[PDB]
Amino acid sequence: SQVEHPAGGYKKLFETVEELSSPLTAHVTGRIPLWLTGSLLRCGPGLFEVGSEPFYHLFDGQALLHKFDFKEGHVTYHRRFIRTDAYVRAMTEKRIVITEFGTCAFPDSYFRGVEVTDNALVNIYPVGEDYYACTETNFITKVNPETLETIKQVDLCNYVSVNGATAHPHIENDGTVYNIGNCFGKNFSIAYNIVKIPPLQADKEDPISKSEIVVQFPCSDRFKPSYVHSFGLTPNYIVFVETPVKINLFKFLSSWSLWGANYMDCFESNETMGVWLHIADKKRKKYINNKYRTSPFNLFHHINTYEDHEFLIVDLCCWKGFEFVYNYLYLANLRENWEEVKKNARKAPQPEVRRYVLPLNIDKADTGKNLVTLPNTTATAILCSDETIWLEPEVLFSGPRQAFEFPQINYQKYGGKPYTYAYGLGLNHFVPDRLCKLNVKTKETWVWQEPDSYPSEPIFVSHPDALEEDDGVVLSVVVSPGAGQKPAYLLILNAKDLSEVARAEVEINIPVTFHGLFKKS
Template identity: 40%
Template sequence: MSKTAEPQTRSLSSRQRCPQASGLECLAPLVRSAEETPDPIPTTIEGTIPPWINGSFLRNGPGKFEFGTDRYTHWFDGMAMMHRFHIREGNVTYSSRFLRSDSFVENSEKNRIVVSEFGTLAMPDPCKNIFARFLSRFQTPKPTDNANVNFVKYKGDYYVSTETKYMRRVNPQSLETKEKVDWSQYIAVNSASAHPHYDRDGSTYNMGNSYSRSGFFYNIIRVPPPEEKAAMEDSADLSGANVICSIPAADPRKPSYFHSFVMSENYIVFVEQPIKIDLLKFMLYKIQGKSFSKVMTWEPQHATIFHLVNRHTGKKSEVKYYTGPMFTLHQINAFEDSEFLVMDMCCGGDGELIGEFTLENLRRNSGEEIDEFYNSLCRNLPRRYVLPLSVDEQTPADENLVTLHNCKATARMTKPGEVYMTHEELHNDELLQFGGLEFPQINYHQFNGRPYRYFYSCGFGHVFSDSLLKMDVHTKELKAWRYPGLYPSEPVFVASPKATEEDDGVVLSVIITPREEKSTFLLVLDAKTFSELGRAEVPVNIPYGTHGVFNEMG
């Protein structure tokens, strides 16, 4: 079942369908180390910041790329820098801090890189003798706690997270670093994703890996809501966390990489894609002098498998849902409609791009150098897959099982217990002019796991996002905010307190530019019209980041 059994529905890849770029500008200023601003500073307001917005826009991402003479190799390796735009009564203040992770502290004390990251292997201590340095090659590298990917929430507490077994609890007001949390002290996992899902009952779901002599498993984790007494204590609390389902890898020697997963009101879907992690290379990578990014390979000879799990019972479906090789980082939304599970996600046909985001590539010169790199990258586009939930021995073979109105996605039973799916494209050709999209966000609080109409994302007409997009999944039309030389962060939707419609609210994004020093601003768009309401200008340089959240309790 791991081999691709069906032809692709399109002869052209998403990269080939998007226009080739020419004359792109250099983005090096967006991936250089920044200085922290621990004490809140005022911003200059242009336009109007709606007075009903009351909270903090929290952002995470790499912010320091060297220690002493040592330089990181990959963008993912930079030390975590947390940013806070506090919004109240139409005014905005800004502050930032580096996460005081063990990695940051140890690197700072030694003034060199002593903890390995995704794309950078820490070299042996030059003060050791030759024999000691040789032996250090055979020591198992410890996972980093450089949590530079996202802000997440468990039992009411905020944490910053990456994709190892470590998180760091943080204070969302002061950005103070608190205790390190080790997932393996609560449940049997070796790592966890930085993209959990939140249930309306207060519980949180996530995915984590585990490997042992019995094989490699993808584990669905549930963390229960906080207890009233525990909520009063100022300490990390993941008590009650449990694994509700363990999914064995299709190839235990080469499990798949994943960044997120799908959740609806009753189901979780794990997408096992053909980006493979070679475990033998992983165990030997330090001896070979290779970073973790070198043990990941794109293997399009394999299919993509969708593992369907009832998140209330933990029971995995016996049906094998699969499609051709594809690459996905971020899910948009999923919901149930009649006897079907509808899944929307950002997908591409080439999974080799993760290892290519080296700082050397990102800092290429304007023109031909950066054009060549950008034109080689995969472009992700929004897709819809539909899983038929009622598949049994009576299901007809080689017949489209998707009967939803106006739905172009298909699902066919190719043999008993196996269903091959093709997707519907959730866009028209206009999106191609924006280079595809990523970093999708919805009105999560009201519409996650439910039928929805709109999502917000970044367009990628450059290596980093150069536009903001509002997508209508009903009409496939889009609205855009795009200006030359301005590079927006992942958009975050904040609902109006008197909202009556799905898009009643604002979209927040941090805008940076390589063209002028200290010209960052927080952008506030009307989510319905996608027109600018106001901006809060702050005289700091902020590197291009990853993910963020809006903390209404800020």
């Protein structure tokens, strides 16, 4: 790493905090643009222990909903814990009641039904007129975006046939929400279903009640689904990537009744499988039977996806290797001293942004040849006798233990479409270190960074009279735990330069946050 952090400020990203009864006024450095009048809503953990019972993993902490509101002249900050079953039961009983991702709860009997986690710390997104905080299970939580108050719990299994769903659904311009999850295939097998929730209608009834299944992807292993964090979507195509990080459902049903495990205990890695890629015709609702294959890696975040003549351009934030990257994300290890953090990540998967290019229409004549005839890429697709199609990427970004993660674009105008710029959070040995801009064509980058300060995902907000793709700002929440300073602040950067425009400073700490959403109010 170019940059070191011997002071260990990043510890404060994983430290419990309390709620606010009502919003704080933020002190403002610089000038806020007058056009920017909305609400930045983000999610993340906020309570990392229940008394003397600690949560162990990064994705175990109880969900905390954050809001930076730019209404009138000032900026305000507010935060409330989401009154989930996981939270409400824990506060009631002064203990950990619901098993989280990596923290297993124990009884204080008569067992009767597994209590799948409710803890929606990962993300928030809009369905119709409403907003839903979520995790990666079937339970999503309706919230009030004005007040941050918890409205309702929704069980997705009541409407669609899926076991869970990602916290990275795609939202179309008309409001239609797409998402992917595990299901049971028609013949004693596992598969992946694409869920479609339509936009609100004149009759005004709940859009979720009109949820449906578009298509079903098959599973490489009959009784083991891969882990799915997100997927790709274009106007005509749906793209799903099957990684070697498999879920071993066997283990959780065994240990639940017998010993007592958690979610992380079910994960295993398929050594010989590599990475399978899948395409579906979105409109015809067909799975296109094209056996795209490539070498092993973990994938959490798609960056963007789009069509180019008879090809799909697929940009991904990868991690080279089949070992589960989440292994490296226990809070005990993230709260280590800097020297020990770097040591711990030495044998970790190596991050790399990759452009994969999938030919849509294959022909047997070109068996044994590179099919990617596009002029401006070095990505490769080889047609074999297997009838499998072996892929090689065009690398866009690669730094030793430096990850371009939590990717974001101008999603409203360019999501699913040809594009040039992507923005992301820099991870220095897993510690969020800096903010990054990237030209996906030229590979040129820009970096914002300051010492002893640890920012969140950079969300792009378009200029209402934008002429270019990068015409707008980037919001990021920044934690600066240095001595004689403001614990944290919201950062606002000009998306062109990546230069600083303003700051909304606060007198209290903010923990790590994962994903969010800007609401143009």
